[PDB]
């Protein structure tokens with residue numbers, strides 16, 4: 320392994336580094352930090368435009384991943400299989416198709432559709448890959464056990480809506496793995512529950528906890544904190560390294576789609592963000608050599624990131640404002656820490672990986688004490704060389720859905736889900752003030768409109784031609800309400816009960 324195929328915790332001050340496999344399985348680091356490659360792999364322009372520009376999503380995934388995963392940890396054959404199977408469940412031949420010049424040619428507004436996977440939400444790109452990864456690593460281990468005493472993992476977590484769907488489809492049917500996901504009853508919209516409870520696979524079982532969602536965090540954090548509950552318990556996270564790694568593929572893919580042939584090789588990505596993982600993957604591609612403009616962070620009212628990038632003050636809010644784009648409604652952007660490590664390393668530790676861990680660890684300590692920390696101007700100045708940000712209100716979110724519906728040209732009446740809207744809204748603000756329409760704008764569409772009907776309906780009610788059922792709801796998604804659900808209620812937030820239900824895996828899990 321080279322400096323890019325080795326990993327360390329953003330909070331560690333030790334010279335020690337672990338393997339890819341270990342970073343992946345461990346998930347979060349013992350000290351609470353996140354894993355990251357101390358050295359970002361460098362790809363030269365020649366290779367980018369002579370060899371990578373001609374590759375398919377899957378082949379790029381291989382080229383990119385070979386840079387962070389050593390041959391020893393995962394051979395070419397095995398890795399190419401993981402990729403092939405991971406993306407074979409995508410309804411688009413391209414996996415992540417770029418829809419170019421949606422609004423005509425007065426500007427260059429491209430929408431990168433990342434919702435063609437099993438659950439119609441962009442988290443499939445990561446989770447399909449990670450799930451297969453887990454199965455692969457767990458398998459090799461057990462490949463020595465004696466059909467008995469063979470380890471088995473059990474992922475457990477709570478869902479406020481969609482998040483869980485992605486995990487369920489990425490772990491469904493994977494050998495020696497089981498997924499138990501708690502969710503507040505009646506608090507989960509129909510379509511999100513249908514995706515979860517519909518899947519036939521046995522290794523999956525959702526729990527309809529009667530209570531609140533913030534109730535489920537504790538009714539599961541307890542099971543998590545453990546007790547005599549040691550048998551290998553998995554975790555439902557957003558900070559796994561494999562996640563970031565999988566998400567890098569489509570930035571490269573779409574970049575080439577937007578520039579191959581064309582004379583303008585200038586492209587700017589606008590990414591509706593929550594926990595920063597998605598856009599952070601774009602950061603990595605940028606540092607690897609992708610010659611792109613500043614990455615645009617688009618957020619909804621929960622603007623912890625927009626505020627930070629503007630003041631250097633990373634302060635957690637008290638209230639989680641409700642918005643039309645729920646999946647970005649967060650108090651603290653978890654992966655942001657990863658960026659802070661690289662920032663701290665370049666502008667405060669003069670390259671010292673270890674002083675960077677010290678610095679980051681103290682910052683997240685101040686957070687867990689004053690709920691806010693200040694960074695030196697050199698940090699925000701360093702971040703502003705690669706990032707721009709925009710805050711999008713609900714009014715603007717809805718109005719953008721309406722504007723694009725009327726405004727779209729290729730195709731006509733293009734419907735946006737609210738999360739993508741937040742992004743297109745920011746994308747349009749940028750087109751306005753960038754003063755360079757030659758720039759290729761690629762706005763990330765993180766969810767298919769059908770996943771958030773309400774926002775789409777309430778914004779397109781004002782059109783006689785609009786019909787959710789005729790223009791949005793996908794046939795494959797229409798069958799859901801008609802498939803057999805596998806519910807399992809748990810009345811009262813009884814941690815003791817959540818435990819018991821989990822235990823009933825009927826031996827044959």
Ligand SMILES: *Cc1c(COP(=O)(O)O)cnc(C)c1O
Pocket residue numbers: 440441442481482557591592593594595596597598646647738765766
């Ligand atoms: C999870 C999610 C987001 C947030 O992505 P991050 O990686 O957490 O920044 C945005 N949109 C949708 C539709 C999501 O499900």
